[model samples]
Target chain A: CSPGIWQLDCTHLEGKVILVAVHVASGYIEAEVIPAETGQETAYFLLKLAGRWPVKTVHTDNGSNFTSTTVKAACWWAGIKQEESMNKELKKIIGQVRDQAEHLKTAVQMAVFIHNKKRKGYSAGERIVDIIATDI
Target chain B: CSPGIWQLDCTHLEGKVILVAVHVASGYIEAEVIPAETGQETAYFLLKLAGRWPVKTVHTDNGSNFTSTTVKAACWWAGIKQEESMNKELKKIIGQVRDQAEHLKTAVQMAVFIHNKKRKGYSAGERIVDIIATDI
Candidate 1:
């Protein structure tokens, strides 16, 4: 997502159809349908379906459906972080996505090494030194 | 009187008053508070009040008071135009605003001509013909 605002291709789905989840940290998107989308409703959906780890943060462009008080309270109750970039280009989460892309590319290269066979195929590190593997 | 938006800025008003004007057709704005916002308010408040052509849309920035419902309605009743812009590159507009902004809007004449007439702020995917994108 460039900035925090993303223009989604109006989805073509075969379901009740209402909401979608875009993992800001991973850009892993899962589209689901609900009878509807309200702040409170999104909370229940995430908790019930997306697991209870709680969202660290969320970013959306416009469509006030995301800004409802229920959504705010859900974030508060779950200790999940919530962030909004009403302005698309200024969202810091986009920066995080850039970081995720870098990580994914490195991960892919490592897979090549292990596939080629350990010292041949890829693991988490093929170049090893260049991969931004967690130092901690 | 038409379907569109106008974005004006505080031209003068340094130690005296605020100047912002909405020029018909060209979108030139002149503001004048008691001390004189050059010709700012004179265009909207006084001149338009006595009965002239009115605007339909109004665009502004993240200034606190611009988004209030009361203000919005007031513009609506007056046949004024209104809209606001978020973070994006309005290079041409910025170029003009910059020149006027430097002088507390003393550059009224030059600024108004350019501002009211020049064009910028086109979105990325606006359809111009049928399936083509248009840009200015």
Candidate 2:
């Protein structure tokens, strides 16, 4: 997401890729660092999350990786409605995400975790995680 | 970009960033694989390109990396008009970019190079890079 080249400084960068998901209704969050954007990889992660959370619908843009037959099949088998994000919304997030926080994969994950934990208009110094949601 | 993780397999994963410029009127394109996306880094690349190409107005989305004082100062000093892309258009391209080509940094470069080379309705396999623009 940076301007300059990101040539490998190591043989295996541990956390170059960070994936995040948020529960719209409850503001729950999940994240992981993975090797690639292939459908199989994403599906594997999502399925793991679905086991713990109530994943009713899944949405993403029409990325080739997300639209792959493997990914589509996974979504279908998982019984989760798969959707895509609107271009306008997706673009805004790209800028916001790239601008804030360190590029380190762990840092990115921690940031999103805090973002989901912090509730809007909470009492002074209160976070979403502080008060357990009534549902799940 | 797709909403997924992009991890590196090597300890020293290289070529993580890419910067690009195009003359809309002429479709002449310039791109490079880079490691980071900072205002200073992007500006340096653009300034270098300006010396070689007839850069009158430069446009990009309002990415934090592209909106730094360093980059803006560089543009002003170079006497180039730097503009921002529309949310709608930028959103559209994000999806198009991820869906068509592989996300590997080098793959992106080659894809854009091909994009510049292939022209619409060109006879006998004419490419954008083939025609020499008088201005440049």
Candidate 3:
């Protein structure tokens, strides 16, 4: 029962489109780089996110990319609600790695990875180790 | 003289800001990821660009980032003209490298690297080799 509302938006790098989704309740984030910001692409991203998180509702701006029939239908079918609405910190991380990093996708992945870790105030490694040594 | 007009704009990835510039006559491209899209940052980027290219005039949208007094003063001191106005191709390249790349700056650097190479129809190595074998 991890039901929660998420905020969604798309940002661009050069011309590439990135769909960013953040859970409002838990502050968890999920993002993917897509070819275009079309409704179909947005829908695909949303469905994928739903698989991992219990998406009760999605809030986004009125951009056509988010409001298109494709996205709306996908949400309706998935039993998810949709609403419409917007981080500088991720950019700061990207700037730090912009020179040495070679791939845009990897840069984003790293930024999100760092972002989530910092938000939780612990690394994923801690959780993993805790799970392994529960008896100790 | 290698005078040329250039187009300028900014794009973002996950909240990271990128400043993109294109040489209209030579089809050369320059881009950088900046922490903020303020006038000061834009001016700093432009001045750095001016040192490498014969920047006669720069064209951009009416965004405050580009139209700021700082940018205008920098252009004025550099004897460059400024015009305000308004690139999908770069985005396409970024999308290709989004996954393997770890840095936003590096991703942009690689995209521009590939882009410039593709535009020239040859690699930098070829030109260097050509210069060395003038007598042979």
Candidate 4:
């Protein structure tokens, strides 16, 4: 009943745990370096970055953090819903991204750009960004 | 159509972004320090931790990360659902926890203990830990 596509996971880069989220619909990616992996904290940062966007549901595994207090409260406040996904493809991309770049953050952002630009059956002239821009 | 509690937000401690998620129902908390503030990583870590728990739904905000692909795929695959909460009280606790401790990780965990213990109308002696242990 929602219209969003993302896969989420946490990993380490340069002695820091990197939070990486990939948008399945448009192949957009968001990443950050953080001090801890708490659902509420993650949601807070995520919401700030996704301002004014409509979210019907979020998907994840049954981690207590995501199912518990801070994350739940923030989601409720924002009127979004959540669910879980298999996330195999998401994981594959992260591994691929890490293998190529010395700087993980830059690599991550670039992967997203690459994803949007390299859509299957879409020409180089037709990009996710350009499509989204026209929609807006 | 699911009953879940949560708290989510990001804070910088020790020059790192700390992601925190607390499950209000079971008095569980998860935290991590990461290089990126993407929802996918948080959801990935959380889902693994929450494996096979009787989670009916998850809660979150309008973060593009939460509402997208891999996260959603896994949740639906696992038969869990997601919802959102207002999170007003959640913010207050995180603020209070920061005020009390320098070690944010320890602080986040301790806050969960405080949360379960502070449940309304319960005597301090009737701790959630004690009760949960007895049930097990």
Candidate 5:
């Protein structure tokens, strides 16, 4: 399997926490609102995301969500390498849409869509489908 | 402008409320996660939507959100006709993705995307761009 790295981070807006994952190679972005930044939640997201992408390694800050035993166990079981991650580009994108959106989830989703659409050198849809096929 | 009617409704999932709007003419779908079902919010969505679609009329159940003075005034100012309205199809689509999604907003967005893509006779992207161009 080809190696792929995902940069993961969480941001808060309007009392909501959103987890964002960026595929370093293709620049494809994925984000979702989560109830809390818990290790279980982080692990779940990683597995779900791995189903769609190669997910060879995930780079995240030393937050408990990423460093917790739960998350470490998940990565170990899945044979994923974990490294301890700007998330600044994503933050800027989310900030631009925050005031315009009624809900934080919508804002994050819009940010991801915009980022993927504007990303160069790839068709987001085609790449997603290709990755899923390759994983299977 | 050609006449177009949108079926509007709100559905609750996982303690979150999502407002869904379906273009009866083209079967194109739009949805968002709302903080609350307030007339002000509905009005904002309507106007934002009008920028993309002709929005001649909007049909919704006699919910206070749709009938409140704020919403009525918004429609009047936009020259949009308001009528009192299945949201069943949309609900079903949302149901299919609910379990798979961590966020209600993501599920709703995915449902809208799926509905638009599977809807026969049009390319959702092209239609959206065409409508925006026509409105301008």
Candidate 6:
């Protein structure tokens, strides 16, 4: 499932790995991760990074740690909006896209959110193994 | 090096292998490599394989081996226009979709060649042989 089509940055904190994702066609920066005691500093770094480019919006949990003034200020200065959702939302997105039989003939999906849209934020994955028996 | 792609089969029994190069877009096969006698069976299988496909033209030598009456019947049923060229004469082709760096300062090259024509075939070939890493 891993294409390893990812880049890492350790500049922010010594030996701390951050995963960076960029949109292929538009050269837009999409997301980043910081392996720190997560929250304010992480959100600040992301907001600042998104500020470098024209950011549209961001989605995260409604955690109090992420709703800090520094993070909100960064997003405001960068002209980026943010969205918050509940932990209960996962149940809303699960089975909708999976039950798509040739783009929706049957809808036995458990989630109501995925019953509406196919998402890029998740579900682009699989695993496989194979072997060949031949000698020539 | 060649446009489109082709496979030619030579089912003759005596002994030999051949390299048959085809220009797919023009439907012309202009080069044939005569290989060793030990792998003659493989050559025969290849020749038969090529005969089954739709081809516009088949060019080969004046050898009685390939021009046998049985071979002629296969060509007729395959609905191919035939041509003969030997002693290193080749049908030339030039269809370039490449450019020097200076000209690519602003790319217009998101043409029908990529996602539509090229990528469509690529997506169909799910797990592929890595030919791109070879030739070094």
Note the DockQ of each predicted structure.
0.01, 0.01, 0.01, 0.02, 0.05, 0.01
What is the per-residue lDDT of model 3 for residues B1-136, given as tens digits with 9 covering 90 to 100?
1335778889878789888887654455667777887887687666555533346788776455556677777677557876622157777888897775456665665566556556255333223223222211
Q: CA lDDT of B86 in candidate 5?
A: 38
Q: What is the TM-score of chain A in candidate 2?
A: 0.56
Which candidate ranks first by lDDT, i.e. highest? 5
Residue A24, candidate 3: C-alpha displacement in angstroms? 55
lDDT of 4 at B110: 45
TM-score for all models, in order of appearance: 0.25, 0.33, 0.43, 0.39, 0.46, 0.21
TM-score (C-alpha, index-matched) for candidate 5: 0.46
Better of 1 and 5 by lDDT: 5
User: Which candidate do you rate higher for lDDT, 2 or 3?
Assistant: 3
Candidate 3 regions with alpha-carbon error over 4 angstroms: A1-136, B84-86, B119-136
Pick by DockQ: which candidate is best? 5
List the candidate 5 regions with Cα displacement exceeding 4 Å. A1-136, B84-86, B119-136
lDDT by candidate, in order shown: 0.34, 0.41, 0.60, 0.48, 0.64, 0.30
Which pairs clash in model 6?
Answer: B9-B46, B9-B47, B9-B48, B10-B44, B10-B47, B19-B33
lDDT of 1 by residue, B25-126 (tens): 333343323354333233334322212112345544435445555455445444555452211222234445554233433333233333333435421111
CA displacement after TM-score superposition, residue B72 of candidate 1 (Å):
59
Model 4: per-residue Cα lDDT over B1-136, one tens digit each: 1224444455555666666564545444445555667666655544442331234556655455466675675466445566623133434565687765445554544444444335455422132223322333
lDDT of 6 by residue, B4-62 (tens): 14434332212433344433332233222234422332233233333222234544443
Where does model 4 exceed 4 Å of error?
A: A5-7, A12-15, A24-27, A84-102, A123-136, B1-136
lDDT of 1 by residue, A16-128 (tens): 33344443432323332345545555655443221211234555544564567765654554445544221122122223333422332222222221222223233211222
Q: What TM-score would chain B of candidate 1 score versus the native chain B? A: 0.39
Model 6 interface DockQ: 0.01
The fnat score for candidate 4 comes to 0.00
Q: For model 3, how big is the iRMS in angstroms? A: 20.4
Model 6: per-residue Cα lDDT over A24-112, one tens digit each: 22212222224554554444455333322223555432345346665565556445565412112322342333343221211111122
Question: Which has the better TM-score: candidate 1, or candidate 2?
Answer: 2
